[PDB]
Each structure stands twice: as C-alpha cells, then as structure tokens.
Amino acid sequence: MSQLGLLPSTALAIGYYNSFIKRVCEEIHGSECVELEGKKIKVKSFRVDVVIPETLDDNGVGNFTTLYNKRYGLSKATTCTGTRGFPFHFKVDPPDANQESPVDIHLLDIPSTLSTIVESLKLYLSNQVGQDFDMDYLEMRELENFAKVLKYLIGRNAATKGYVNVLTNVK
Amino acid sequence: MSQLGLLPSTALAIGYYNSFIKRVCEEIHGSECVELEGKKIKVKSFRVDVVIPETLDDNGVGNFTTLYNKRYGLSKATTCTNPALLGTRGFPFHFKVDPPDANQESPVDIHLLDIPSTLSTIVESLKLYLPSNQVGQDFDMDYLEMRELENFAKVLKYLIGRNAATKGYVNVLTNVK
Amino acid sequence: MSQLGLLPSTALAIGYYNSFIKRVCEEIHGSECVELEGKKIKVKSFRVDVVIPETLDDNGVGNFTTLYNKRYGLSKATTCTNPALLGTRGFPFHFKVDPPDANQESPVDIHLLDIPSTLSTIVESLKLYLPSNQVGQDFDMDYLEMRELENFAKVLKYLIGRNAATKGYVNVLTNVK
Amino acid sequence: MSQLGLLPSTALAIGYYNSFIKRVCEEIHGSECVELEGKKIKVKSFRVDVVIPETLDDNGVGNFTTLYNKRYGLSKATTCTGTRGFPFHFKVDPPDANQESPVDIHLLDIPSTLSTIVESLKLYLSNQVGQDFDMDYLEMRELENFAKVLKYLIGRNAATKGYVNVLTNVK
Amino acid sequence: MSQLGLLPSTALAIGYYNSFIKRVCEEIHGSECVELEGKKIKVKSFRVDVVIPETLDDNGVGNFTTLYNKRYGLSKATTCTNPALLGTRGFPFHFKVDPPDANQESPVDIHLLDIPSTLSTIVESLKLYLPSNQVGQDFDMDYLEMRELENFAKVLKYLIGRNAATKGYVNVLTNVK
Amino acid sequence: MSQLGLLPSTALAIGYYNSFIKRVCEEIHGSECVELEGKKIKVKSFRVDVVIPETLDDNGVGNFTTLYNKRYGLSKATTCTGTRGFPFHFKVDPPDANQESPVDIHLLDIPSTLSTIVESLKLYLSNQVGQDFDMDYLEMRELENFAKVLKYLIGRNAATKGYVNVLTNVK
Ligand SMILES: Nc1nc2c(ncn2[C@@H]2O[C@@H]3COP(=O)(O)O[C@H]4[C@@H](O)[C@H](n5cnc6c(=O)[nH]c(N)nc65)O[C@@H]4COP(=O)(O)O[C@H]3[C@H]2O)c(=O)[nH]1
Ligand SMILES: Nc1nc2c(ncn2[C@@H]2O[C@@H]3COP(=O)(O)O[C@H]4[C@@H](O)[C@H](n5cnc6c(=O)[nH]c(N)nc65)O[C@@H]4COP(=O)(O)O[C@H]3[C@H]2O)c(=O)[nH]1
Ligand SMILES: Nc1nc2c(ncn2[C@@H]2O[C@@H]3COP(=O)(O)O[C@H]4[C@@H](O)[C@H](n5cnc6c(=O)[nH]c(N)nc65)O[C@@H]4COP(=O)(O)O[C@H]3[C@H]2O)c(=O)[nH]1
C-alpha cells in the first residue's frame, strides 16, 4: 500500500488518474469517438498505455515525451465535448484502417505530472553536479510508487480496469 | 516561504505552473495565435487569470469549473501547435474576448480564465492526509483546505514573478465565489 | 575591482567579451557588413548595447531575451565570415536600424541589442552555490543575483574600455525592466 | 561529483550544455533540418561530438578550432528558426550524399567557452614565462572536470543522451 | 635621461628606431620612391609620424592600429627594395598623400603614419612585470603603462634628433586618442 | 623558465612571437597563399625556421641576415591581406615546382629584433676595444633565453606548434 509523502508520488498519481485517465476513458466510452485535425473518427475500442520512463530528465519529461512520440507514429487527438477536451497521443492497432468504419485505438501517454517529481526532488534534496545515488534511489522509488498507485487506482473503476495499462521503466 | 509538505499544495502549484501556465504563456507569446473550433485567431495581447476557488467541492473542482465557465462566456480554445513539433500536445483552455464584440480576423485581445483542475488532487489528498470517520462540517478540514489553497496561490504568484514570459501576464484570483 | 569567485560573473563576463562582444565588434569593424536573412547589408556605423536584465528568470534569460527581441524590432542577422577563412563561424545577433526606414542597399547604421545568454549559467550556478529546500522569494538569493549581475556589468564595462575595437562602440544597459 | 570552483570548469560546462548542446539537440530534433549557405537540408539523424583539446592555447581555443575545422571537411550550418540560430560545424557520414534526401550529420564542436578557462587561469595563478607544472596540472584538471560535467549533463536529457559524445584529450 | 629597465620601453624604442624608423627614412631618402599596390610612386618630400596611443589595449595595439589606419585614409604601401640587394626585405607602412588628390606618376609628398606595433610587447610585459589576480581598473597598472609609453616617446625623440636621416622628418605624436 | 630582465631577451622574444611568428602563421593558415613580386602562390604546407645566430655582430644581425639570404636561394614574399603584410624570406621544399599548383614553403627568418639586444648590451655594460668574455657570456645567455622563450611560445599556439622550428647557434 502507498501513503502520502513529502515528495508527491502518490498524490500526483491520484491526480493523474482522476484528471486524465479516468476522464479520458469515460469520455471515450461515452462518445465512442475522437476528434483529430478538425474531423471525428469512431472508436471500436481503446487501449491506453501510460509510459513511466526509467529515469526522469533534469528539465522534465517533455523531451522524452517528444522523442517517444517521434519514435512511433503517434497522432494527436482530443476527446470530443463548458468543459474542455483532453488532447492525447494515440496510434491505430493496425497500420491503417478505413476511417468511416470504427477503428481500434492505442492511446499512449507519458505522464507530464512526472515533471513535477523532478521539481519536488530538487527541493527534497544539493550543491554537486554528478550522479547522486541517493537522488537516483529517490527517483526510482518515486517512479515505482507512482506506477503502483496508478495500477491500484485503475484496479477500481470498471471504465478503466482492463482498458488501461502501465508500462514502467521504458528506455 | 512555501515548501514541500505531506499535502502537496506546493508541488501541485509547481507542476501547474511548469506544465500549463508557463507552457501556455510561452506558446501564446511565440505563436501569437490560438485555435477555436478548428480556426485560428491571432492574439494581439493576452492575459491569464488563475481562478482559485474559495472552497473545494467534495468531488473536485470539476463542478465549480463547469459552472464558472458558463456563468461567464469563456469559449473553449486550444493553443496552436506548430506542424514542426509533432510530439508536443496542445493545451485546451477557456477564454473570453475582452471586447466581447471584436473582429475575429483582426488581432484580438483574449482573457484566459482557467480554474486549476489540479486542485482536485488536493481534495483527494485531504481524505488521506486527515481521514474523517464522520460526515459534516469539520473545522480542521476547512482550515487545511484554506491553508493549502493559500499556499497554492502564493506559489503561483511567486513562480509567475520569476519568468518574463508570465510575469505581468498571469494573475492569481484568490477566494472566488 | 572584480576577481574570480564561486559564482562566475567575472569569468562569464570575460568569456562573453572575448567570444561575442570583441569578436562581433572586430568583425563589423573589418568587414563593415552583416548578413540579414542571407542578404548582405553594409554597415556605416554600428553600436552594441548589452542589455543586462535587472533580475534573472528561474529558467535563464531565454524568455526575457525572446520577449525583448520582439517587443522591439530587433531583427536577427549574423556577422559575416569571409569565404577564405572557413574555420571561423558566424555570430548571430539581434539588431535594429536607427532610422527604421533606411535603404538597405546603401550603408546603414545598425543598433545591436544583445541580452547575454551566458547570464543563464549564473542562474544555474545559484541553484548550486546556495541550494534551497523551499520555494519562494529569498532575500539572500536576490542579493547574490543582483550582485552577480552588477559584477558582470562592471567587468563588461572594464573590458570594453580596454579595447579600441569595442571602446565607445559597446554600451552596457544595466537593470533593464 | 563536480561542484562550483574559483576557476569555472563546472559552471562553464553547465552553460555550454544548457546554451548550445541542449538547444542545438532539441532544435535539430524538432525542425529536423539545418540551414547551410542559406539553403535547408533535412536531417535523418545527427551525432554531436564535443571535442575537448588536450591543452588550451595561450590565446584561447580559437586557433585549435580553426585548425580542426581545416583538417576535416567540416562545413558551417545554423539551426533553422525572436530567437537566434546556433551556427556549428558538421560533416555528413558518407563522403557525400544527395542533398534532396535527408542526410545524417556529424556535428563537431570545440567548446569556445574553454577559452574562458585560459583567461580564468591567468587570474587564478605569474610573472614567469615557461612551462609551469602547477598551471599545467590546473589546466588538465579543469579540462577533465569540464568533460565530466558535460558527459553527466548529456546523460540526463533524452534529447542529448546517446546523441552527444565527448572526445576529450584530442591531439 | 632614459636607461634600461625591466619594462623594455627603452630597448623597444631603440629597436623600433634602428629597425623601422631609421631604415624606412634612409631607404626613402635614397630611392626617393615607394611601392603602392606593386606600382612605384616617386616621393618628392616625405614625413613620418609615430602615433603613440594614449593607452595600450589589453591585447596589443593591433586593434587601435587597424582602426586608426581606417579612420583616416592611410593606404598601405611598402618602401621599394633595389633588385641588387636581395637580402634586405621591405618595410610595409601606412601613408596618405598630403594633397589627397595628387598625380601618382609625378613626385608626390607622402605622410607616413605608423602606430608602433612594438608597443604591443609592452602590454605583454606589464602582465609579467606586475601580475594581477583581479580584473578591473588598476591605478598602479595605468601609471606604469603611461610611464613606459612616455619613455618610449622620449627615447624615440632623442634617437630621431641624433640622425640627419630622421632629424626633422620624423615626429612622435604622444597621447593620441 | 624565463622572466623579464634588464636586457630584454624574454620581452623581445614575446614581441617577435606575437608580432611576426604568430601573425605570419595565422595569416598563412587563413589565406593559404603568399604574394611574391606581386603574384600569389598557394601554400600546401609551410614550415617557419627562425634562426638565432651564434654571435650577434657589432652593427646587428642585418648583415648576417643578408649573408644568410645570399647563401641560400631565399626569395622575398609578403603575407596577403587596415592591417599590413609581413615580408619574409622563404624557400620551396623541392628545387622548383609549378606556380599554379600549391607548393610547400620553408619560411626562413633571422630575427631582426636580435639587433636590439646588441644595443641593449651596449647599455647593459665598456671603454675598451677587445674581446670581453663578460659581454660574450651575456650575449650567449641572452641568445639562449630568446631561443628558449620563442620555443616555449611556439608550443603554446596550435597555429604555430609544429609549423615553427628554432635553429639556435647557426654558423
Ligand atoms: N495528454 C494529456 N494529459 C493531461 C491532460 N490533462 C491532464 N493531463 C495529465 O494529468 C496530470 C494532472 O492533471 P490535473 O489534475 O488536471 O492538473 C493539470 C491541470 O490542472 C493543468 N493543466 C495541464 N494541462 C492542461 C490543459 O491542457 N488545459 C487546461 N485548461 N489545464 C491543464 O496543469 C495541471 C498539471 O498538469 P501536469 O502537471 O502536466 O500533469 C497532468 C497530465 O499529465 C490533457 O489534456 N492531455
Ligand atoms: N548573440 C550571440 N551571442 C553569443 C554568440 N556566441 C557567444 N555568445 C555569447 O558569448 C557568451 C560566451 O560564448 P562562448 O564563451 O564562446 O561559449 C559558448 C559556446 O561554446 C557555445 N555556444 C554558444 N552559442 C553558440 C553558437 O551559436 N554556435 C556554436 N557552434 N557554439 C555556441 O556555448 C558557450 C556558452 O554559451 P552562452 O551561455 O550562451 O553565452 C555566450 C553567449 O552569451 C553568438 O554567436 N551570438
Ligand atoms: N610598419 C612597419 N613597422 C615595422 C616593420 N618592421 C619593424 N617594425 C617595427 O619595428 C619594431 C621592431 O622591429 P624589429 O626590431 O626589427 O623586430 C621585429 C621583427 O624581427 C619581427 N617582425 C616584425 N614585423 C615584421 C615583418 O613585417 N616582416 C619580417 N620579416 N619580420 C617582422 O618581429 C620583431 C618585433 O616586431 P614588433 O613587435 O611588431 O615591432 C616592430 C615594429 O613595430 C615594418 O616592416 N613595417
């Protein structure tokens, strides 16, 4: 089990689940379509993977997110809607499919909230510039806690259980 | 002098600034345009107000956000993403036109009104930081909630003060409704 | 009198002068021309201002530089490199024309405005020299930051005064915005 | 472990990484093209080698940089863009390739910031003209510290990790 | 009186006179013709001024020299070398024509303006004579620099006064700019 | 090791290096061509030999310089260019080579600054006309100091290191 700590892996995981993963899953289940490039596409079924990098960059996970999106053929799409949508990166299970017919979708998201952890660590613990085993252990433990909490929370909602997966220690 | 605590007001504020406020401010500064219903509008000058609710609801700030967004005009738009950078995503937000009747084709001033959704996390942490066996008005819960909202606002003010991209372009509205 | 210290305002100022200010000044003195959007433009009389920000942002002077370069005209050009010397690289910079509407064909004055990007390093050294466990205005950090900016400006002024190439052709604007 | 010192090898390395290496790596990743002689060439991939000379000259690393660019067929090119470009020296991984098609580029940069170290040494330590073993050791240690800090910082950002190499003690 | 010292203003002045001023004056007196762009021009009456800068730059008189030679006309020429004597080399210098618009074919009065490059060495000696751990305006450095420049000028004056070849044809301009 | 003295070997060597040797080497490296009798010749590679004569003549090294240039087939050439050229005496590595093609050049220079030392010696110490072993020792030591300082400064700049040699005690 996980508990609230001084550096927020549990709370950030809870916020990420309740603000993005739960909401995006519910929106896809309800509307059953995603809007990209000004045009809608139906979703036969969605599988969303949250990718937790093995190590966080000094300046946040934005660079890793951009490189990961470049590596694969990920395309941007928002959840169709006084409430805002949720842009995300996804790929179609087959290389391509007829747009008019519904197409299964493979959402991929690198949690931007992980950037906060970096910041928190800068406050949590230095006047040295080098590999610090204490801070490395802290990063690894916080990433593990984030993944564990997110998995447990996904194991609660029928709208996300089975449809959401966690891929930790990527690259 | 805010810092880290078991209740992550400081960390959530830092994340909100470095993920949405800073990113949105930089994107609007650079592109000088936003996207609404798929069509672009150039932005002459923008301004963002972070509306911190006076008190957080039981189920997050979603209901307050949705009621505040339609009590005012606050049409939904997204900050444009250049075709060059495929990895970066867009940041949807809610905005009004400071002159309500303005030429969309011409450059237009925009007022960005965003209620930090990350505050919802605070609520979901209050149930964990100080679990309550009883249901009803708790004077300790309210004190912690107000203290952490104030910490959030103070952290946002400080962070906005330390960036020319956002300094003077972002204001934090505290104790709204 | 400024000397070496843990915070490298002196060393960074020396490097900035010897690598950009001196090099650009000598290149414009010799070639008497610059490269705007790839096209040659002759320089009649140039002059450089080193815009030292009053306070450095959290993430370096990048955002302040990018907002300053567009608040004013400050189109981007590069100091030309002759084909004979292949090794030497060009130094891009931002400049305006003192008469904004001037014939590019004929020799034209240019006002070079450069916010030293090296100042960013100072910020990244403040996080090392005096680490802080808390986020918020620190009156000790502000003192060190302003002292280091003052040292940078003073060293730049001195080094400019000791070279006919840069003496009088370079000005240090301190405490800007 | 590297910390701030009186003669700035660590701070100069941090500035070099955050101002040139990181910025150039991200710009190449994003734009995926470099402008040379005023015309663009696409970049399938890039490798950035930062060359730390064995010994810094008395007047700075400028002469070594010019000689290095002369010895190899390195060509000048900026990063396409109120922000400026980053001119650099690069070489294409075959002898030549069709410009229309994307071509891999091997950037080679001798950090000009190393010049500052020379100046710093002049302030750090003499009224003599000869091989000063004390200053020689100081220069060697500063070059080693610069290389170590730059390697560590390269190993942090996903936009430079694996794509940037450090060649220390060259010639 | 001027004598030898650790800072070699006297020795450098002696070398400058015996190597450039005396040689150039004697060669112009004899040949009465110089070489501009490879083309011979006859000299009717010449005169040399040794422009001693008021203050020496940090990196030698190179920048001041090349900026003075361009602020005024001062086209570069070289004293002609007779084909008979192969061993002797030429002495390039910068000169203008006292009447700016004069016939090159006919004899022409020439004004030779030379900023002693040897003064650069003095700077390189001041760093050795009185090493400084700090960078900034030093009142002791300035005194030594001005004293050495004045000694250089005085030695040049004396040496010129002692030779009919250079007496009355060479003037030392002290404290220029 | 060398330091400033009353009769300037070190300062004269520094001036010779920074005013002729460094400048000439840099200009040859840059322009890669030398002008002789008004026509340019490309330089494939250059070697600069600075000759320190065994003993300085009474009137200076000018007469020795003329004799040395007479002995060999040295030819005059300036460095192409508000900066002046640097006339010098050079020789082609082979007996002759095609003008159009680049040709190696063995620049040969007898430092005229050495003449100054003679005058310096006249001021350093006599009312006799004869062999003064004291003055001979001073002259030899000063020539050694000049050669040592010039050798050291040559191995400091990458533009002159390896391309410049010092031939002390010639004839
Ligand atoms: N692909 C994708 N992921 C999303 C989106 N919204 C949230 N997330 C993820 O969920 C984290 C926390 O969301 P939050 O509680 O709503 O709290 C958010 C939220 O209140 C605000 N924010 C972030 N992005 C946006 C946005 O695009 N529009 C608006 N109006 N607010 C945003 O900043 C706070 C912190 O954001 P992060 O630290 O980066 O971390 C976010 C992010 O990793 C989305 O629209 N698309
Ligand atoms: N407008 C303009 N300013 C210039 C330029 N080059 C240097 N500066 C300024 O001079 C400072 C020191 O440069 P550096 O010592 O040669 O040492 C630099 C250099 O080694 C490298 N670097 C910086 N910019 C470039 C570039 O544009 N091209 C290449 N190839 N290297 C660069 O990073 C070091 C530190 O950079 P900074 O922190 O940014 O700080 C730079 C920067 O503020 C230029 O081309 N244009
Ligand atoms: N305008 C002009 N001025 C001249 C010329 N030759 C000498 N001078 C001046 O006389 C000073 C002393 O010359 P040096 O004793 O023969 O001793 C000189 C000489 O051995 C050598 N050197 C300097 N310039 C040249 C050159 O142009 N050609 C050659 N072959 N050697 C040079 O470096 C020594 C010190 O040079 P500096 O520090 O520059 O200082 C030089 C320089 O200021 C000349 O041809 N044209």
Residue numbers in the entry:
A (entry chain E), D (entry chain A), F (entry chain C): 146 to 226, 232 to 275, 277 to 322
B (entry chain F), C (entry chain B), E (entry chain D): 146 to 322
Sentences reproduced from the published study:
In response to the nucleotide second messenger c-di-GMP produced during cyclic oligonucleotide-based antiphage signalling system (CBASS) immunity, SfSTING rapidly assembles into oligomers that form single filaments and antiparallel double-filament structures that make supra-molecular contacts between STING and TIR domains of opposing filaments. The TIR domains are not as well resolved in the main double-filament class, probably owing to conformational heterogeneity, and we therefore focused structural analysis on the single-fibre filaments.
Stimulator of interferon genes (STING) is an antiviral signalling protein that is broadly conserved in both innate immunity in animals and phage defence in prokaryotes.
